[PDB]
Design a protein around this ligand. Sequence first.
Ligand SMILES: O=c1n(-c2ccc(Br)cc2)cc2n1CCCC2
Ligand SMILES: [Cl-]
Ligand SMILES: [Cl-]
Ligand SMILES: [Cl-]
Lengths: 151, 151
Amino acid sequence: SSPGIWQLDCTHLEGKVILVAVHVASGYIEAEVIPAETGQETAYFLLKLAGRWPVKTVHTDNGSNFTSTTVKAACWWAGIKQEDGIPYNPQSQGVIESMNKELKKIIGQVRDQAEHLKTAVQMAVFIHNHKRKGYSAGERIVDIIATDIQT
Amino acid sequence: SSPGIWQLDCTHLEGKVILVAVHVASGYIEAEVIPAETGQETAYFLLKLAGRWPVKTVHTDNGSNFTSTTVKAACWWAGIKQEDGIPYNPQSQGVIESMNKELKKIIGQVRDQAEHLKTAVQMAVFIHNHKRKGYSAGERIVDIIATDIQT
Ligand SMILES: O=c1n(-c2ccc(Br)cc2)cc2n1CCCC2
Ligand SMILES: [Cl-]
Ligand SMILES: [Cl-]
Ligand SMILES: [Cl-]
């Protein structure tokens, strides 16, 4: 199950919304800037994600996206099991919180290199996914999925 | 090195532009709809791509993008070797052409399920990357990159 599990996360900066998908087992992320977190924006984001990686399960970021007919339609279309994001394990909240703080720190470090926030966010995605902690998140996700394919 | 080689491709539909990146060894793709193919749009697309996969070399789709200072700046930022896309092997032009025709066929098959072209394009990316040819393009890219990380 673990190779296909992702978590949605919504954070705010500069009066805008940054929508993040985290591959839970690796820490690998994809992210986008949107005007506001609507069902239509979340649905489209999930469609993109699932065309790019083998997304089996998504823990949604809030109850509005869990309820959304548009989000449910995208999950149906893309073969995604839509689940809640209730942190039954309480360390999940702290991990997400730490991630948002770290992403915002990186955005700050690149902000002056980017005219638009969306460029800074994608620079932050790049830096995060390439950072060695020794393997990177990008290396870990590929290894996890490749091992799963060989089953 | 083949695991890191991508090719840019620009095709047109409904008076709009579809920008495609193909992982040459696997056939895996990412794509976006843009109003027009500018250096700024191409640069941003490459930044996104390189944050998500280990992009070493990009064969650019035309001379304007090869020349573009904005595209060159993004390639510099993201650690991408920007190359030309001259088909020294002539089978390349046919492979790209066949890809565009197939993508447009899939878009036609889903078009009525999508209000906006961009949704149809992402549905086509999904269908293409999951199609078993027996492995899918999505499976092939992960295997190729995972083997490269391990060797
Ligand atoms: O590195 C991260 N993150 C993460 C993602 C982005 C940033 Br920026 C910081 C941490 C989230 C997780 N992991 C590892 C596995 C648990 C989930
Ligand atoms: Cl919002
Ligand atoms: Cl949208
Ligand atoms: Cl154009």
